[PDB]
Short mmCIF file of all heavy atoms in Angstrom, two decimals:
data_model
loop_
_atom_site.label_atom_id
_atom_site.label_comp_id
_atom_site.label_asym_id
_atom_site.label_seq_id
_atom_site.Cartn_x
_atom_site.Cartn_y
_atom_site.Cartn_z
N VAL A 1 140.18 -102.30 -187.44
CA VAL A 1 140.24 -103.67 -186.98
C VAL A 1 141.55 -104.32 -187.45
O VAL A 1 142.29 -104.90 -186.65
CB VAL A 1 139.01 -104.49 -187.47
CG1 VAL A 1 139.18 -105.95 -187.10
CG2 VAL A 1 137.73 -103.94 -186.83
N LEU A 2 141.80 -104.23 -188.72
CA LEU A 2 143.02 -104.88 -189.28
C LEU A 2 144.29 -104.25 -188.70
O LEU A 2 145.29 -104.93 -188.44
CB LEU A 2 143.00 -104.79 -190.80
CG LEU A 2 142.07 -105.75 -191.52
CD1 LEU A 2 141.61 -105.15 -192.84
CD2 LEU A 2 142.76 -107.07 -191.76
N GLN A 3 144.26 -102.93 -188.49
CA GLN A 3 145.45 -102.23 -188.01
C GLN A 3 145.75 -102.60 -186.57
O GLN A 3 146.97 -102.88 -186.23
CB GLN A 3 145.27 -100.75 -188.16
CG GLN A 3 146.48 -99.93 -187.65
CD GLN A 3 146.28 -98.45 -187.82
OE1 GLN A 3 147.25 -97.66 -187.75
NE2 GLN A 3 145.04 -98.01 -188.04
N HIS A 4 144.79 -102.62 -185.70
CA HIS A 4 145.03 -102.75 -184.26
C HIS A 4 144.84 -104.15 -183.72
O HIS A 4 145.51 -104.49 -182.70
CB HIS A 4 144.14 -101.78 -183.50
CG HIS A 4 144.40 -100.34 -183.85
ND1 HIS A 4 143.64 -99.66 -184.78
CD2 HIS A 4 145.30 -99.47 -183.35
CE1 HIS A 4 144.08 -98.43 -184.82
NE2 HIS A 4 145.10 -98.27 -184.01
N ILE A 5 143.97 -104.98 -184.27
CA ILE A 5 143.66 -106.26 -183.68
C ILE A 5 144.25 -107.40 -184.52
O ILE A 5 145.07 -108.18 -184.00
CB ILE A 5 142.14 -106.44 -183.54
CG1 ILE A 5 141.58 -105.28 -182.63
CG2 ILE A 5 141.80 -107.79 -182.97
CD1 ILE A 5 140.05 -105.27 -182.59
N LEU A 6 143.85 -107.54 -185.76
CA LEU A 6 144.16 -108.75 -186.53
C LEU A 6 145.66 -108.83 -186.81
O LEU A 6 146.30 -109.82 -186.60
CB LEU A 6 143.36 -108.78 -187.80
CG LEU A 6 142.08 -109.67 -187.80
CD1 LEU A 6 141.10 -109.16 -186.76
CD2 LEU A 6 141.47 -109.74 -189.16
N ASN A 7 146.22 -107.76 -187.37
CA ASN A 7 147.64 -107.79 -187.79
C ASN A 7 148.58 -108.00 -186.61
O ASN A 7 149.48 -108.87 -186.72
CB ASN A 7 147.97 -106.51 -188.55
CG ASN A 7 147.41 -106.49 -189.94
OD1 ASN A 7 146.88 -107.51 -190.44
ND2 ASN A 7 147.47 -105.34 -190.62
N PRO A 8 148.51 -107.24 -185.51
CA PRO A 8 149.40 -107.53 -184.37
C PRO A 8 149.27 -108.91 -183.82
O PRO A 8 150.24 -109.63 -183.51
CB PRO A 8 149.00 -106.48 -183.34
CG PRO A 8 148.42 -105.37 -184.14
CD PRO A 8 147.64 -106.05 -185.20
N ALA A 9 148.03 -109.44 -183.69
CA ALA A 9 147.80 -110.78 -183.16
C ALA A 9 148.41 -111.84 -184.08
O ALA A 9 149.13 -112.76 -183.59
CB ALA A 9 146.33 -111.04 -182.94
N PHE A 10 148.19 -111.73 -185.35
CA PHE A 10 148.74 -112.70 -186.28
C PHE A 10 150.27 -112.61 -186.37
O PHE A 10 150.93 -113.62 -186.51
CB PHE A 10 148.10 -112.56 -187.65
CG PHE A 10 146.78 -113.26 -187.80
CD1 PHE A 10 145.71 -112.86 -186.99
CD2 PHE A 10 146.61 -114.31 -188.66
CE1 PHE A 10 144.47 -113.51 -187.15
CE2 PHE A 10 145.39 -114.97 -188.78
CZ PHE A 10 144.32 -114.58 -188.01
N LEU A 11 150.79 -111.39 -186.29
CA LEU A 11 152.24 -111.21 -186.30
C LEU A 11 152.88 -111.89 -185.08
O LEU A 11 153.87 -112.56 -185.19
CB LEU A 11 152.59 -109.75 -186.32
CG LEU A 11 154.12 -109.36 -186.40
CD1 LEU A 11 154.68 -109.73 -187.76
CD2 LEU A 11 154.27 -107.88 -186.08
N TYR A 12 152.27 -111.69 -183.90
CA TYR A 12 152.77 -112.37 -182.69
C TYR A 12 152.68 -113.89 -182.82
O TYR A 12 153.64 -114.60 -182.48
CB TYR A 12 151.99 -111.90 -181.47
CG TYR A 12 152.55 -112.41 -180.15
CD1 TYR A 12 153.47 -111.66 -179.41
CD2 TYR A 12 152.13 -113.62 -179.64
CE1 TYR A 12 153.96 -112.14 -178.23
CE2 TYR A 12 152.62 -114.11 -178.45
CZ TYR A 12 153.54 -113.35 -177.75
OH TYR A 12 154.03 -113.85 -176.54
N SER A 13 151.56 -114.38 -183.33
CA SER A 13 151.40 -115.83 -183.54
C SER A 13 152.45 -116.39 -184.46
O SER A 13 153.04 -117.44 -184.18
CB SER A 13 150.00 -116.15 -184.04
OG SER A 13 149.92 -115.83 -185.41
N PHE A 14 152.71 -115.71 -185.58
CA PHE A 14 153.72 -116.18 -186.52
C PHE A 14 155.13 -116.13 -185.94
O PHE A 14 155.92 -117.02 -186.11
CB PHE A 14 153.67 -115.38 -187.82
CG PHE A 14 152.49 -115.69 -188.67
CD1 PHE A 14 151.73 -114.70 -189.23
CD2 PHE A 14 152.14 -117.03 -188.97
CE1 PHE A 14 150.63 -115.01 -190.07
CE2 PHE A 14 151.10 -117.35 -189.77
CZ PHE A 14 150.31 -116.32 -190.33
N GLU A 15 155.39 -115.07 -185.15
CA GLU A 15 156.72 -114.92 -184.50
C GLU A 15 156.92 -116.06 -183.50
O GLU A 15 158.02 -116.59 -183.34
CB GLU A 15 156.83 -113.61 -183.81
CG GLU A 15 158.19 -113.31 -183.21
CD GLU A 15 158.39 -111.86 -182.81
OE1 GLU A 15 157.44 -111.23 -182.35
OE2 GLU A 15 159.52 -111.34 -183.00
N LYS A 16 155.87 -116.45 -182.79
CA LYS A 16 155.97 -117.53 -181.82
C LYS A 16 156.06 -118.91 -182.53
O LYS A 16 156.61 -119.89 -181.96
CB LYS A 16 154.76 -117.57 -180.87
CG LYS A 16 154.79 -116.39 -179.89
CD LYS A 16 156.02 -116.41 -179.01
CE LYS A 16 156.07 -117.64 -178.18
NZ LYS A 16 157.27 -117.64 -177.26
N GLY A 17 155.52 -119.01 -183.73
CA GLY A 17 155.55 -120.25 -184.51
C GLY A 17 154.25 -120.99 -184.60
O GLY A 17 154.22 -122.13 -185.11
N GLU A 18 153.13 -120.40 -184.15
CA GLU A 18 151.83 -121.04 -184.14
C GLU A 18 151.08 -120.87 -185.45
O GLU A 18 149.83 -120.95 -185.48
CB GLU A 18 150.99 -120.50 -182.99
CG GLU A 18 151.69 -120.48 -181.64
CD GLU A 18 150.88 -119.77 -180.59
OE1 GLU A 18 150.04 -118.93 -180.91
OE2 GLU A 18 151.10 -120.09 -179.39
N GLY A 19 151.81 -120.60 -186.54
CA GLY A 19 151.16 -120.31 -187.81
C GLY A 19 150.38 -121.50 -188.38
O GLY A 19 149.27 -121.32 -188.93
N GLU A 20 150.88 -122.71 -188.22
CA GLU A 20 150.22 -123.88 -188.74
C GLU A 20 148.87 -124.11 -188.05
O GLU A 20 147.86 -124.38 -188.72
CB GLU A 20 151.09 -125.11 -188.54
CG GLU A 20 152.49 -124.96 -189.13
CD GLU A 20 152.51 -124.66 -190.62
OE1 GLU A 20 151.83 -125.41 -191.36
OE2 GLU A 20 153.15 -123.69 -191.02
N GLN A 21 148.79 -123.97 -186.74
CA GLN A 21 147.53 -124.12 -186.02
C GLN A 21 146.59 -122.97 -186.31
O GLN A 21 145.38 -123.21 -186.51
CB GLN A 21 147.80 -124.22 -184.54
CG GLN A 21 148.74 -125.36 -184.14
CD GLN A 21 150.18 -124.90 -183.93
OE1 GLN A 21 150.87 -124.55 -184.91
NE2 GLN A 21 150.63 -124.86 -182.69
N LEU A 22 147.10 -121.74 -186.35
CA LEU A 22 146.26 -120.57 -186.54
C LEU A 22 145.62 -120.59 -187.95
O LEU A 22 144.39 -120.40 -188.07
CB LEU A 22 147.05 -119.29 -186.31
CG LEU A 22 146.23 -118.00 -186.44
CD1 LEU A 22 145.02 -118.04 -185.50
CD2 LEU A 22 147.08 -116.78 -186.16
N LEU A 23 146.43 -120.77 -188.99
CA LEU A 23 145.89 -120.80 -190.34
C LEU A 23 145.03 -122.04 -190.55
O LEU A 23 144.11 -121.98 -191.40
CB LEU A 23 147.02 -120.73 -191.36
CG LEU A 23 147.80 -119.42 -191.31
CD1 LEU A 23 148.94 -119.49 -192.38
CD2 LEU A 23 146.94 -118.24 -191.53
N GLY A 24 145.33 -123.16 -189.90
CA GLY A 24 144.67 -124.40 -190.20
C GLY A 24 145.21 -125.07 -191.46
O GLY A 24 146.43 -124.93 -191.76
N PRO A 25 144.39 -125.77 -192.17
CA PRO A 25 144.88 -126.65 -193.25
C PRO A 25 145.36 -125.81 -194.44
O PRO A 25 144.78 -124.77 -194.79
CB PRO A 25 143.66 -127.47 -193.65
CG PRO A 25 142.48 -126.64 -193.22
CD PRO A 25 142.93 -125.88 -192.00
#
């Protein structure tokens, strides 16, 4: 799960700049 789903999705989100919304407070 971490290798194929969570890590790529979060890496893409951080690269786009959506880290503040994704992580929340």
Side-chain angles (χ1 to χ4, degrees):
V1 173
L2 285 151
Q3 178 179 197
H4 297 96
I5 302 171
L6 262 62
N7 286 350
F10 277 63
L11 183 71
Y12 186 93
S13 76
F14 286 133
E15 185 168 38
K16 292 298 299 181
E18 312 173 334
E20 307 301 309
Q21 303 98 288
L22 183 55
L23 296 180

